[PDB]
Amino acid sequence: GSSGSSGIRRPMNAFMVWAKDERKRLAQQNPDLHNAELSKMLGKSWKALTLAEKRPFVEEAERLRVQHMQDHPNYKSGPSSG
């Protein structure tokens, strides 16, 4: 059941994504701690990960970002021509 907000508002990066799952563990582990506090852990665990580990979280966040742009071309436009 969906009781609350739905759909994503802003895009996420490789770190954010991979965290989306990790953070959850932090929230339950620290019901008194907040994001700012959780991150501290989401980072140490992230930077530690390797390329192959970020591969699955890197090819995903890249798709979410490009999207937020589709809504508005105010990101980057201007190909090459002779």
In degrees rounded to 5, what are phi and psi of residue 7? 60, 150
**Distance (Å, rounded) from C-alpha 15 to C-alpha 46?**
7
User: Cα 69 to the chain's mean position, in Å?
Assistant: 15
26 touches 45 (CB < 8 A): no
Look at the chain and report how many structural domains it folds into.
1
What the block records as the tokens of 63 is 């798709």
C-alpha distances out from residue 40 to 22, 51, 59, 66, Å? 12, 20, 24, 27
Number of CB atoms found within 10 A of residue 20's CB: 14
Retrieve residue 26's tokens. Answer: 């932090």
CATH number at residue 62: 1.10.30.10
Range(s) of the domain holding residue 10 = 1-82
Q: Do residues 68 and 12 make contact, with C-beta atoms less than 8 angstroms apart?
A: no
61 DSSP assignment: H
Residue type, 61: A
Q: How far apart, in whole angstroms, are the C-alpha atoms of residue 54 and residue 58?
A: 5
